[PDB]
Amino acid sequence: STGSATTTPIDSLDDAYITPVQIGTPAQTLNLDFDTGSSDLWVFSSETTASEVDGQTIYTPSKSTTAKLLSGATWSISYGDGSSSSGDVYTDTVSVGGLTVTGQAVESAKKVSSSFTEDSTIDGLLGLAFSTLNTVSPTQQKTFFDNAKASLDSPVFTADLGYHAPGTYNFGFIDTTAYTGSITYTAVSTKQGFWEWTSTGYAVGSGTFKSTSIDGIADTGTTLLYLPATVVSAYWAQVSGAKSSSSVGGYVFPCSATLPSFTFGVGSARIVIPGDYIDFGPISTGSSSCFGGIQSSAGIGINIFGDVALKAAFVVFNGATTPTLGFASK
């Protein structure tokens, strides 16, 4: 089997992407944030504290003839941005782009933190990291991809995120029309539960490539590109007036600037992020200070190849017995 679904930016900055997902019988369609940096499929629901729902579409398990309470199971998750959610668990039928999994754990939120409530466009998350990170207790649950893998034509999914435009998540096949050149594959460590790999270096604009190993994660659920402070300083030093602002929380730059591109290495191959992809717009409405798309990871503990980086490539998440990542230009 295969599946193919369109993923759409939630706003004019590409802050996140939502993909329609069918849950239950008859189908209830929710728009979920596919997140290769976490491993829980959780939704706003009829159980969510009413004051914490503000415009989202909810899953109502009592209206699904295929829903079953997973007795005793609870979940609770906290993300790198400080947001969180928790609740109980049902199993139900879940379909993405024509690909159906029966018995998928659907984690029903009883509580969500303010940033989730405040974002009316995201009805939940669909985790695509390794199932060892799933938070369900006392019996850990598998991701949608893990449950689907054996049925897929090939044990892979691909992320093709657009710049200010829709893109595609495919399951079970590699669309050879969706990229240019060849796909370069690189080793993955699953020891932390992430799609963790080592970039071979970077360049700023037309500058020379610096060969240096940068360990990080391919994370569709993080907006920006977080890299070591040395790399990020080298980038922003090429932008007149750019500076790190402790009050804003990162590098800002004059909105009048034209930004240089940023290249990262994948083996001997190179992925170029155009300068425009690094512009996240005014820090507050009407400001002439703009927020940068490349930021320091120094306070995180891990480097993160988020959407800013991933949207410049066609990315293969290869879930073969030994997982690997593939990157192609497009």
From Swiss-Prot:
Recorded GO MF terms: aspartic-type endopeptidase activity
Active site positions, chain numbering: 35, 199
Residue stretches making up the Peptidase A1 domain: 17-328
Disulfide bonds, paired cysteine numbers: 255-290
Annotated EC: 3.4.23.22
Enzyme class: hydrolase
Domain of life: Eukaryota
Name this polypeptide is given: Endothiapepsin
Name of the coding gene: EAPA
Residues of the full protein shown: 90 to 419 of 419
